[PDB]
A paper describes a structure:
The [name] domain- and [name] box-containing proteins, [name] to [name] (also known as [name]-1 to -4), contain a protein interaction domain known as the [name] domain, which was first identified as a sequence repeat in the dual-specificity kinase splA and ryanodine receptors, together with a C-terminal [name] box motif. The presence of the [name] box motif suggests that the SPSB proteins may function as part of an E3 ubiquitin ligase, with the [name] domain determining the substrate(s) for ubiquitination, and this has been confirmed recently for [name] (Z.K., R.S.L., R.S.N., and S.E.N., personal communication). All three hSPSB proteins share the same conserved [name] domain fold with two short N-terminal helices packed against a bent β-sandwich, comprising two 7-stranded β-sheets. The structures show remarkable conservation of the [name] domain fold and absolute sequence conservation for positions in contact with the (E/D)(L/I)NNN motif.
Residue numbers in the entry:
A (entry chain A), B (entry chain A): 33 to 152, 157 to 233
Write the structure that this text describes.
């Protein structure tokens, strides 16, 4: 479904000021993660017993085709390391280890460890993966949000991987992430957007 | 290649005394992991900057078909989380993040995150995985060592996954593990062995 995606990716990527406006929101997060003091593009998870922790981006998209880059080293990431989008009503912390992005009707996510899609559950993505199989992801991916068609999809190392979710029109959705393990650091860079007329 | 493997697995599993004799060696380890004070079957990794840390089991096998169970929650595990076997000469620490089990001629390992086999490199396992694919492992696996035929293989949730390495006759090889990330806890239980006559 890359509609104006080739156009969006041909644009020079947005510079630092736009990247920062679209970045992790230091005031819309689990009490157990923080945006770093010298890198406002990167949050750090700082755990205590049995917690799943999330953070939303500053901008909720009701509109346009948008693309952002997530760096999460593969090393720092196992199961229930989820990348996706969420309503402003998605719980951003839980007690225990869960798929919190995708927990309820308020969030949609891709488990980078399991290659499974979450939303209320447990569907495989990319669809060409077989049973007991996972896509071997590198340190970064692209999250492609289309609030005009109402879909979510991902690119990894140049490959468009398919539409992951549909039915997202009429909502306002932010870059979100949730992690269950370790002192992870997840960078996000807004790449670009094409707004409607 | 399950030769006497069906016989080995039909035996009642070894009890706690045998499990402990075959367990992690608190004196054959990276200075940055420790065997837990109240659980001598489990090591805990306790990191500092840029380190890859290993631990070997107490018993080096020159002989027999042997099987042990590794519990490493999937959550606590990404790339360069390696399970395997090593000569008594395998480095058990490095400065930086590497595939240290499989680093040189002295060790053989399976990256649970990448589904790749290491030894000197980078081969896929199970072989039926395609390009860019990984096997989605659960919290535990079986390491099956055959020092009579000289092979290493793995079982996951009842499925024998194939011979991973060959050419291991004439050596003495220990359960080994290396981890690069987080405060992982890896349990190992020796399951059983069939010695030759
Ligand atoms: Ni921390
Ligand atoms: Ni620790």
């Amino acid at each position: 479904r890359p509609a104006r995606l080739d156009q969006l990716l041909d644009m020079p990527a947005a510079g630092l000021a736009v990247q920062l406006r679209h970045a992790w929101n230091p005031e819309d997060r689990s009490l157990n993660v923080f945006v770093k003091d010298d890198d406002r593009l990167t949050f750090h998870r700082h755990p205590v017993a049995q917690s799943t922790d999330g953070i939303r981006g500053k901008v909720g998209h009701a509109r346009g085709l948008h693309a952002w880059q997530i760096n999460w080293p593969a090393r720092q990431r196992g199961t229930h390391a989820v990348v996706g989008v969420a309503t402003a009503r998605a719980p951003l912390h839980s007690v225990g280890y869960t798929a919190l992005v995708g927990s309820d009707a308020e969030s949609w996510g891709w488990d980078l460890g399991r290659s499974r899609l979450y939303h209320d559950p447990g569907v495989a993505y990319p669809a060409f993966l077989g049973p007991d199989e996972a896509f071997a992801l590198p340190d970064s991916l692209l999250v492609v949000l289309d609030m005009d068609e109402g879909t979510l999809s991902f690119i990894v190392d140049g490959q468009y991987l398919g539409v992951a979710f549909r039915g997202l029109k009429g909502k306002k959705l932010y870059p979100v992430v949730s992690a269950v393990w370790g002192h992870c650091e997840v960078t996000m860079r807004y790449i670009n957007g094409l707004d409607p007329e």
